[PDB]
């Protein structure tokens, strides 16, 4: 027992509609691919979700500038 | 206990967002506190100015610090700094100056510093640190 | 007015007793204040640990800071440090890290920073500063 | 008026101040008048207290602090 659901474009990316039968109660899931081409989604805990969300928002340019610590001795 | 995220572990968290470290955070007891030094916050602001979208970066920082508060020190930071700046100068083995300030901030709080750069910080022998990557 | 003495002018004053400084201090109004950054106080502590008589050095430091109070940071120092650390990255580290923290401390207080022989500070274009050893 | 002695102190010269002319300050301004006389003028109370704040530090302290590295 399974359903069909739609792949669609959102922004510059791809996304899949989650029917309510399968709704997640977190905002972040782990995603991996099995040998057969199946993509598997496994939610994280709510606490891990809320903590790791704090580091969403920092792009590569920011990481570039931050990594450039140029932290010389006293 | 206070747990202080250093600048490098916050870079790691932005590059690799690993579940491992989220697990260790949850283990923190109720009266515990998760924080960064004003040093690290200043480095985050620097990165905001060196990034493509400044207003975006600043909003990311503001959200981050709402949960990992920025702490500002008192005179005890200067006592640890004088002591360790002298010790390491005599050894000829100085560490980065911002890292030194960060380490002495952690000492002044009797805090645990969370870093993925243990070799540098091990030179500050009184420092409690943990690597939440390893 | 808040006058923040940087580390170089304090060192200078330990080695010299110059007339120019007496005159500048004489011109100070009654609500004017002399302070030092926590950065500078930490460097003082470091000199004490590196000195022959630790307990005498600490005593002299206590006397100094009773008059020249140490100030500790708040959020504004970090905003200024982030801006100027970024700008100064292009210019080849023309300002030492502790000098930069001190400058940003003065910026955060709208203090006038008092220095000796740190012309680099002119690169921080919104910093108010003076060399009280020169005319 | 009185007489008093010039002598050497370390590597520098000095003048003895007789009791009746003692100063209450650690620092005086010294200058030469138009007729060549040397004048010692005490600095103000404010100035004396400021400069005193820096007199207690010895050369090992300064040598360590002069190493800012920065």
Automatic annotation (TrEMBL), chain B:
Pfam family, one: PIN
Cofactor(s) required for function per UniProt: Mg(2+)
Entry keyword set: Hydrolase, Magnesium, Metal-binding, Nuclease, Toxin, Toxin-antitoxin system
Enzyme's top EC category: hydrolase
UniProt KW Hydrolase keyword: yes
Family matches, as InterPro entries: PIN-like_dom_sf, PIN_dom, Type_II_TA_system_RNase, VapC_family
A GO molecular-function descriptor: magnesium ion binding
The protein's Enzyme Commission number: 3.1.-.-
CDD domains, alphabetized: PIN_HiVapC1-like
Superkingdom in the source lineage: Bacteria
Entry binding sites for Mg(2+): 6, 99
Record domain PIN: where: 3-124
Function in brief: Toxic component of a toxin-antitoxin (TA) system. An RNase.
Family, per entry: Belongs to the PINc/VapC protein family.
Descriptive protein name: Ribonuclease VapC
Gene: vapC1
Automatic annotation (TrEMBL), chain D:
Name under which the protein is recorded: Antitoxin
PROSITE patterns on file: SPOVT_ABRB
PANTHER family from the UniProt entry: ANTITOXIN VAPB1
Pfam family, one: MazE_antitoxin
InterPro entries, alphabetized: SpoVT-AbrB_dom (IPR007159), SpoVT-AbrB_sf (IPR037914), VapB_TA_antitoxins (IPR051734)
Keywords of this entry: DNA-binding, Toxin-antitoxin system
UniProt key word DNA-binding: yes
GO MF entries: DNA binding
Lineage: Bacteria, Pseudomonadati, Pseudomonadota, Gammaproteobacteria, Pasteurellales
Family: Belongs to the VapB family.
Coiled coil region boundaries: none
Residue ranges of domain SpoVT-AbrB in the record: 4-45
Gene name linked to the record: vapB1
Bilayer-crossing regions: none
Protein's UniProt keywords contain DNA-binding: yes
């Amino acid at each position: 027992s399974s359903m069909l659901t739609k792949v669609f474009q959102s922004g510059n990316s791809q996304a899949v509609r989650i029917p309510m039968d399968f709704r997640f109660d977190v905002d972040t899931v782990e995603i991996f691919r099995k040998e057969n081409g199946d993509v598997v989604l496994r939610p994280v805990s709510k606490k891990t979700d809320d903590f790791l969300a704090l580091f969403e928002g920092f792009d590569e340019t920011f990481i570039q500038a931050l990594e450039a610590r140029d932290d010389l001795p006293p | 206990m206070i747990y202080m995220l250093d600048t490098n572990i916050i870079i790691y968290l932005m590059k690799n967002r690993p579940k491992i470290i989220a697990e260790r955070v949850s283990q923190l007891l109720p009266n515990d506190r998760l924080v960064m030094s004003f040093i690290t916050y200043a480095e985050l602001i620097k990165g905001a100015f060196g990034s493509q979208n400044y207003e975006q970066s600043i909003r990311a920082i503001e959200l981050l610090t709402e949960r990992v508060n920025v702490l500002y020190p008192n005179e005890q930071i200067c006592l640890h700094y004088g002591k360790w700046a002298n010790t390491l100068k005599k050894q000829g083995r100085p560490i980065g100056n911002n890292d030194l300030w960060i380490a002495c901030h952690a000492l002044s709080l009797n805090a645990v510093l969370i870093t993925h750069n243990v070799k540098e910080f091990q030179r500050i022998t009184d420092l409690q640190w943990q690597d939440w990557t390893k």
